[PDB]
Enzyme design. Structure first.
Site, PDB file in Angstrom:
ATOM      1  CB  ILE A  17      -1.032  15.751 -29.854  1.00 51.26           C
ATOM      2  CG1 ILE A  17      -0.366  15.868 -31.216  1.00 51.26           C
ATOM      3  CG2 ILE A  17      -0.530  14.500 -29.148  1.00 51.26           C
ATOM      4  CD1 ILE A  17       0.863  16.714 -31.188  1.00 51.26           C
ATOM      5  N   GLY A  18      -2.836  15.993 -27.610  1.00 49.79           N
ATOM      6  CA  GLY A  18      -3.144  15.514 -26.276  1.00 49.79           C
ATOM      7  C   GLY A  18      -4.463  16.025 -25.724  1.00 49.79           C
ATOM      8  CB  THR A  19      -7.512  14.713 -24.793  1.00 49.07           C
ATOM      9  OG1 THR A  19      -7.203  13.317 -24.686  1.00 49.07           O
ATOM     10  CG2 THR A  19      -7.777  15.059 -26.253  1.00 49.07           C
ATOM     11  CB  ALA A  20      -5.215  21.354 -21.023  1.00 50.42           C
ATOM     12  N   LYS A  21      -6.017  20.810 -24.144  1.00 53.82           N
ATOM     13  CA  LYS A  21      -5.618  20.447 -25.497  1.00 53.82           C
ATOM     14  C   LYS A  21      -4.227  20.983 -25.821  1.00 53.82           C
ATOM     15  CB  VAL A  22      -1.081  19.725 -26.563  1.00 58.03           C
ATOM     16  CG1 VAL A  22       0.170  19.779 -27.434  1.00 58.03           C
ATOM     17  CG2 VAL A  22      -0.754  20.137 -25.139  1.00 58.03           C
ATOM     18  CE  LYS A  37      -0.090  22.282 -19.839  1.00 61.59           C
ATOM     19  NZ  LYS A  37      -0.178  21.218 -18.805  1.00 61.59           N
ATOM     20  CG  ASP A 129       1.373  14.194 -11.128  1.00 58.85           C
ATOM     21  OD1 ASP A 129       0.591  14.819 -11.878  1.00 58.85           O
ATOM     22  OD2 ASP A 129       1.283  12.967 -10.904  1.00 58.85           O
TER      23      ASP A 129
END
Ligand SMILES: COc1cc(-c2cn[nH]c2)ccc1C(=O)Nc1ccc2c(c1)CC[NH2+]CC2
Length: 313
Positions: A17-19, A20-22, A37, A129
């Site tokens: 899914i997410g772009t 570190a990779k998950v 993650k 953050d």
């Protein structure tokens, strides 16, 4: 490839899914879905100690609105973090799909944020953050805070000048910026050039849309005070009149997931599978090494909360 050897014994991998990779995965022994993650040790250089000390943070935060850490697996040149399954999407993309959210939906949603952030402060931490891309939805559309850690549009102005700040008040400002985005769909301080945006944050002047209510406009002025001394405190925000509109009770921030006392049915089930007596297993669970036992216990704990039998396949 060799880095995954020790991990594929504990999980079966799925989508990415997410772009570190998950990558989505299924923990074998409980059948519970997770998110893993994946960070690469050779890219980030030696700023992993800031990430390692933030991993040690997540190891000490457990909360209904904090994305739970289950398992940290460190190999030769990769670090794996197994986290809570959040399939409801991201808060940022959701705001964009609706352009803006109602005042009552934001209120519902902002109360889960205050609950999360208030809890992390009681433990002596600060997220530092806070932004909508750091908030996930689960299946119940409940919020889950992620990525404890330069995102300029949400930074408090004393963080901007590089002055000395309190972590709590910086989050309070960030929540104020984020409250604005929830009800408007655009940043309070925004610009193409950073120097102009850098200056606009410290001036403190933002345009107010016509649709924000009188109860809404003054809370934003309380949260986005440029000077930290005048910024609203978390204590006064937990029972703020705007926070208690629609739902008249103070924000419940105290966590419902401690470390101290382990779940009995989870411990007994872990004992029959590992073929150990009870106190021996409790002593190994109490170490909280965030190995595969911590992951199994935590996911077995969640498995009971759902309603499934506390059983390991
Ligand atoms: C980016 O995805 C995640 C990141 C973290 C995270 C990052 N940092 N800390 C925690 C924790 C959980 C997730 C997650 O559950 N991913 C996810 C996102 C969207 C969807 C699914 C999963 C299900 C597949 N269908 C599409 C909808």
């Amino acid at each position: 490839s060799k880095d995954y050897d020790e991990l594929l014994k504990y999980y079966e991998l799925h989508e990415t899914i997410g772009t570190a990779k998950v990558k989505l995965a299924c923990h074998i022994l409980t059948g519970e879905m997770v998110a893993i993650k994946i960070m690469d040790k050779n890219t980030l250089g030696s700023d992993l100690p800031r990430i390692k000390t933030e991993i040690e943070a997540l190891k000490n935060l457990r909360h209904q609105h904090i994305c739970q850490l289950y398992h940290v697996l460190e190999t030769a040149n990769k670090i794996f973090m197994v986290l809570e399954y959040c399939p409801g999407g991201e808060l940022f993309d959701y705001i964009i799909s609706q352009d803006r959210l109602s005042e009552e939906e934001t209120r519902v949603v902002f109360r889960q944020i205050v609950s999360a952030v208030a809890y992390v402060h009681s433990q002596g931490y600060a997220h530092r953050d806070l932004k909508p891309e750091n908030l996930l939805f689960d299946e119940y559309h409940k919020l889950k805070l992620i990525d404890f850690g330069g995102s300029l549009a949400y930074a408090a102005p004393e963080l901007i000048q590089g002055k000395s700040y309190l972590g709590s008040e910086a989050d309070v400002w960030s929540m104020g910026i984020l409250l604005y985005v929830l009800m408007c769909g655009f940043l309070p301080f925004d610009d193409d050039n950073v120097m102009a945006l850098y200056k606009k944050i410290m001036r403190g002047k933002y345009d107010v849309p016509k649709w924000l209510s009188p109860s809404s406009i003054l809370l934003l002025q309380q949260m986005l005070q440029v000077d930290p001394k005048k910024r609203i405190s978390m204590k006064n925000l937990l029972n703020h009149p705007w926070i208690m509109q629609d739902y008249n009770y103070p924000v419940e921030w105290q966590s419902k997931n401690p470390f101290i006392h382990l779940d009995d049915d989870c411990v007994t089930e872990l004992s029959v599978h590992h073929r150990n007596n009870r106190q021996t297993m409790e002593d190994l669970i109490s170490l909280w090494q965030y190995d595969h036992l911590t992951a199994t216990y935590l996911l077995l704990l969640a498995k009971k909360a759902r309603g499934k039998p506390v059983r390991l396949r």
